[PDB]
Design an enzyme around this catalytic site. Sequence first.
Site, PDB file in Angstrom:
ATOM      1  N   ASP A 121       0.842  -1.180   0.000  1.00 11.32           N
ATOM      2  CA  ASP A 121       0.000   0.000   0.000  1.00 11.32           C
ATOM      3  C   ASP A 121       0.901   1.263   0.000  1.00 11.32           C
ATOM      4  O   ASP A 121       1.845   1.369   0.793  1.00 11.32           O
ATOM      5  CB  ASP A 121      -0.888  -0.072   1.247  1.00 11.32           C
ATOM      6  CG  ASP A 121      -1.947   0.986   1.294  1.00 11.32           C
ATOM      7  OD1 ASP A 121      -2.062   1.764   0.388  1.00 11.32           O
ATOM      8  OD2 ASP A 121      -2.625   1.121   2.310  1.00 11.32           O
ATOM      9  N   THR A 159      -6.861   3.402  -2.094  1.00 17.83           N
ATOM     10  CA  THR A 159      -6.595   1.965  -1.902  1.00 17.83           C
ATOM     11  C   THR A 159      -7.628   0.996  -2.445  1.00 17.83           C
ATOM     12  O   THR A 159      -7.298   0.139  -3.279  1.00 17.83           O
ATOM     13  CB  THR A 159      -6.422   1.693  -0.408  1.00 17.83           C
ATOM     14  OG1 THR A 159      -5.367   2.545   0.021  1.00 17.83           O
ATOM     15  CG2 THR A 159      -6.042   0.261  -0.184  1.00 17.83           C
ATOM     16  N   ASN A 685     -24.190   9.874 -23.012  1.00 20.52           N
ATOM     17  CA  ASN A 685     -24.517   9.180 -21.743  1.00 20.52           C
ATOM     18  C   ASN A 685     -23.241   8.850 -20.952  1.00 20.52           C
ATOM     19  O   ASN A 685     -23.278   8.064 -20.011  1.00 20.52           O
ATOM     20  CB  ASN A 685     -25.386   7.926 -21.987  1.00 20.52           C
ATOM     21  CG  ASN A 685     -24.679   6.881 -22.851  1.00 20.52           C
ATOM     22  OD1 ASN A 685     -23.581   7.115 -23.347  1.00 20.52           O
ATOM     23  ND2 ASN A 685     -25.290   5.714 -23.001  1.00 20.52           N
ATOM     24  N   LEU A 689     -18.431   4.791 -24.373  1.00 21.07           N
ATOM     25  CA  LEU A 689     -18.718   3.970 -25.545  1.00 21.07           C
ATOM     26  C   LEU A 689     -19.493   4.770 -26.611  1.00 21.07           C
ATOM     27  O   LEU A 689     -20.334   5.622 -26.295  1.00 21.07           O
ATOM     28  CB  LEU A 689     -19.568   2.749 -25.126  1.00 21.07           C
ATOM     29  CG  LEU A 689     -18.999   1.870 -23.978  1.00 21.07           C
ATOM     30  CD1 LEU A 689     -20.041   0.813 -23.629  1.00 21.07           C
ATOM     31  CD2 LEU A 689     -17.707   1.231 -24.459  1.00 21.07           C
TER      32      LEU A 689
END
Length: 805
Positions: A121, A159, A685, A689
Site C-alpha cells: 500500500d 486503496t 450518456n 462507448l
Amino acid sequence: WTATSGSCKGRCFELQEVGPPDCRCDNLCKSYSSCCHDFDELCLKTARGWECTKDRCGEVRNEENACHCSEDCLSRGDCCTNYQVVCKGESHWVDDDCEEIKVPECPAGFVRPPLIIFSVDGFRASYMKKGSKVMPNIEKLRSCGTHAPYMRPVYPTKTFPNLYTLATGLYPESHGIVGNSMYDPVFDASFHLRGREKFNHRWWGGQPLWITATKQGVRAGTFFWSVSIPHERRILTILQWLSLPDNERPSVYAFYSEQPDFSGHKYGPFGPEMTNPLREIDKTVGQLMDGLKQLRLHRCVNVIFVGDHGMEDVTCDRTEFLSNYLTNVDDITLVPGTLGRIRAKSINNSKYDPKTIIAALTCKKPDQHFKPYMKQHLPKRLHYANNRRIEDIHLLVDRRWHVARKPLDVYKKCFFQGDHGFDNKVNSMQTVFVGYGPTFKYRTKVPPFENIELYNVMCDLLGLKPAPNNGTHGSLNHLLRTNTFRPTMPDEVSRPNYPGIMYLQSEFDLGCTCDDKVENKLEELNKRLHTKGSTKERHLLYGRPAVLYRTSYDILYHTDFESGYSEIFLMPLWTSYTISKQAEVSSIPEHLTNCVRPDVRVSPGFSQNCLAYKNDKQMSYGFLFPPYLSSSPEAKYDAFLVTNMVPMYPAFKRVWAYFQRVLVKKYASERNGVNVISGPIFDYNYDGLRDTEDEIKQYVEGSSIPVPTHYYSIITSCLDFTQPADKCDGPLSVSSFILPHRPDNDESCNSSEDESKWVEELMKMHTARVRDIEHLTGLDFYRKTSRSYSEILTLKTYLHTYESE
Ligand SMILES: *[C@@H]1O[C@H](CO)[C@@H](O[C@@H]2O[C@H](CO)[C@@H](O[C@@H]3O[C@H](CO[C@H]4O[C@H](CO)[C@@H](O)[C@H](O[C@H]5O[C@H](CO)[C@@H](O)[C@H](O)[C@@H]5O[C@H]5O[C@H](CO)[C@@H](O)[C@H](O)[C@@H]5O)[C@@H]4O)[C@@H](O)[C@H](O[C@H]4O[C@H](CO)[C@@H](O)[C@H](O)[C@@H]4O[C@H]4O[C@H](CO)[C@@H](O)[C@H](O)[C@@H]4O)[C@@H]3O)[C@H](O)[C@H]2NC(C)=O)[C@H](O)[C@H]1NC(C)=O
Ligand SMILES: Cc1cc(OCc2n[nH]c(=O)n2C)c(-c2cccc(C(=O)N3CCOCC3)c2)cc1Cl
Ligand SMILES: [Ca+2]
Ligand SMILES: [Ca+2]
Ligand code: NA
Ligand code: NA
Ligand SMILES: [Zn+2]
C-alpha cells in the site's frame, strides 16, 4: 449472533467460510467479530518470535511456538522461514546469484506454477530506485525478473478502488468502488473504510480474480487479511497452504502490507522515518523467498510485487475551503480531500442548483488549487463518470493540496504530511510492478503500463479465461516468457462504399457559397487520379480504420487527405492525413473565408447544409482536414468540401484552429513528420462507448446534424525519428487526445490570453490512449502495419502523460 464456543483446533486459517452463527477460524473472522473462542490461542501463536536461532536447531517440537526449528518442521510445513539458513547451513535467497528460470522447477504434484501477489500500500514508483540500497530482496526481484519503471494506477488514486481494479481488470466506474467513501442513492446506503457496510456484497461489482479462479476449478488463498494478523503470520500461513496435499492446495495467493502507506501519511513520501518501513517490507519479502526456497518452490512460483498508488507531500495548510467560495455552503455535502465530490445535503431542497455551484467555483482566485467539473466533462482518460455513486459535481484537486468544506473540518477531525488520490497521471501517484518467476522474462525492463491490464495477465498465469474487463488482452504479452495470449484482430462489420461523381452542383440547395468558379489535360488527369486514391498510401499509413458496427459510410479520397464519411451522422467518422517535416503552413485566402462546397460524390440528402449554421446562433463549423496545411492552392479547395465540415462552437474553434494552424506543424517538425487521424465523438450518456443515433441529445438547430461531445486526434510517427513518418521501418510512436466540445473555455482560466498560453495545456489534460478512442468510436486502427499484433495492442494502450522524468 456468533456461537463462539466451537473450536479452531485443526482449523486455523481454513479456506472455506463456515456459516453463521457457527464460529469461524478463517482469516475474515476478526473482521466480523466471529472467531471461535480459541482462535488467538491456536491460530495467532507468537511464542519465541519468528526466527530460528542456533540453540533452537533440532529442538523437541513445542506446539506453542509461533514457528518451528525441530527436525520435523519441513515435513510439517511450519518451519520459521530462516530454518535452513540457521540450522542447515543454507544461504538466504537474496545472497544467491540470480540464475535464469527457463522452465518451472516444481515439486511432483504441482499442476501449474502457483501465483503469489505481494501487494504493498502506498509504494511510490520512485522508491524502487531511491530505496534500493535498503531493499536488497526487492532489488533482486526487480533486477532479475521483469519490471516496469512505474505502473499507472486508476483514478481516484485510493486503496480500495485500486486494489479492486487489480482484482477485476475494471475501471472503478464499472466495478463500483469509486472511492474509499461512497453514497449509493439507489440503496440509500453509505460505504466507509471503518465499519461493516463495506463487507456487503452489493458494493462489489465485476468478478475478482479469486472468484474467476474458483469458478474454473482453481483454488485461491485469502486476499483480504484482517489488519491485526502480523505480517510474519500472513507469510507463514501462505507457506503452510503451499504444503497442503495437491487436491487441497490453492494455486493463487495474496499478501498485503499496509506499509509504506501508513507511515507515508504521517511523514511524507520521503520523510527520514520512511527508511525503516521500507527495510521492514524488504525483510518480509526475504521471509517469503527464504520460505519458498525451503519448500523447493523458489524457481516454481510466479511472484508479482505490486503497489496500489503512490504518495505525495500534502499538509493541512494547503487546503482550499469551499466556505471561501459558496454563500450556501451548508446546503451541500462534500466528499473531501485529494478529490472533491459534491451533492445536495437534502433532496427536498428545490433551491439547490448545480449550475450556480459550478460557476461559484470556477476561476475565482488567481492561484486556485482545484478545478470544478460536471463529471461528464472530466478528462475521458479518467473513465470516471458512469456510476450513480459518482456525484455529478467533481473537483479535481492540484497535487499537494486538499479541498475541504469549512476550516473547522481540518482541525476538529495539522498532523499528516502525505496523501494520495490525485489524477492518476501525476508522477507522485505512480506505483510499482515487478514479476519474477518461470513465466516472466529474465532481466527485462518493460515500458510503463496501467494496472487495469494485470487481471488478464494473472488469468494467463493461472490458465484462466478472464471475465469481461477493461484490459486489452495481449497488450502485456511482452512481459511473459510463455502463456502469451494471441488475439486476432476484430472483424470489420461494415464495408465502405467508394462513390464516384454522381451529382450535379445544381442538385444541391444547401445555402452554401464558394468563390471557386476559377477555370488542362496535363493536370485534369492528375485531379481525377487523386479522387480515385492515388495519394492514399501517403495519407493512410496504417490501413483504413475498420468500422466494428453496422452503418452506412463512404470512403472519400483527396490529394491531401482521406476520410470515412458517415451517411448517418452527416460527417466523417475519421479523416486521415500525413504532414511531412518539410510541410508549409498557409492561410485561408480572403476569397475563400466563408467557402463551403457541395461534394458531388455525396447526395444532397446525406450532406450538411450552411443554412442550419446560419440559423443556429450558438453553433459555427470547422474542418477536419485543415485548410492551413493544403499542399497547393488548387488542393486547398478540397478542404472546403461540405463532407470535411463538422459542427463547432465558436469557443471550441479557438482551440481547434490553434491545434490545426500551429500545433500540427510543430509536431511534424519535432517528430520528423506526423500522420494525423481526427474525428468526432458522441458520448452523451458518458459511458465511454460510441453513442447510437438515438442517444444524441443535441443537433445543429433545425437540422439532423448531430453535435459531437468531443473531437479526437491520433498523431503517429516513427519511434526512430531519424526516419520520416511516411517511411518508417520499425516501431511507431503515438500521442492522442479527446478534447471536450464545449461552448465556453471556462475550464481554461487563462483563455482570455493568446492560445499560445493555454491551448496546449488543455490538450495535455485531455491526453488519451488510442484504445479510449476505439471504445468511443467503434473504430479499430493500425490494421495494416509491419508490426506484430501484440506490439500494436501495446501501442494502442500507450498514454502520453506530459509529466517530467
Ligand atoms: C469496461 O469493461 C466492462 C466489462 O466488460 C464494460 O461494462 C459492461 O458494459 C456493457 C454495456 O454498458 C454492460 O452490458 C449491459 O449489461 C446489462 C446487465 O448487466 C448486469 O449483468 C452483468 C453480468 O454479470 C453485470 O456485470 C452487471 O454489473 C453492473 O451492475 C451492477 C449494479 O446492478 C453493479 O454491481 C456492477 O458494478 C455493474 O455496474 C456497472 O455497469 C452498469 C451497466 O450494466 C452501469 O449502469 C453501472 O453504472 C456500472 O458502471 C449487471 O448486474 C444489460 O441489461 C444491458 O442490456 C441493455 O442494453 C442492451 C444493449 O445491447 C439492450 O439491447 C437491452 O435491451 C438492455 O436494455 C434494456 O435495459 C435498459 C436499461 O434499464 C433500458 O433502458 C432499455 O429500454 C431496455 O429495457 C447491457 O448489455 C455490462 O453489464 C457491463 N459490465 C460491467 C461489469 O460493468 C465497460 O463498458 C468497459 N468500459 C469501457 C469504457 O470500455
Ligand atoms: C492483492 C489484493 C489485496 C486486497 O486486499 C488486501 C487487504 N487485506 N487487508 C486490507 O485491509 N486490505 C486492503 C484486495 C481487496 C481489497 C479490498 C477489498 C477486497 C474485497 O473484494 N473484499 C474485502 C471486503 O469485503 C468484500 C470483499 C479485496 C484485492 C487484491 Cl487484488
Ligand atoms: Ca492504499
Ligand atoms: Ca455512449
Ligand atoms: Na451559427
Ligand atoms: Na476561460
Ligand atoms: Zn493511504
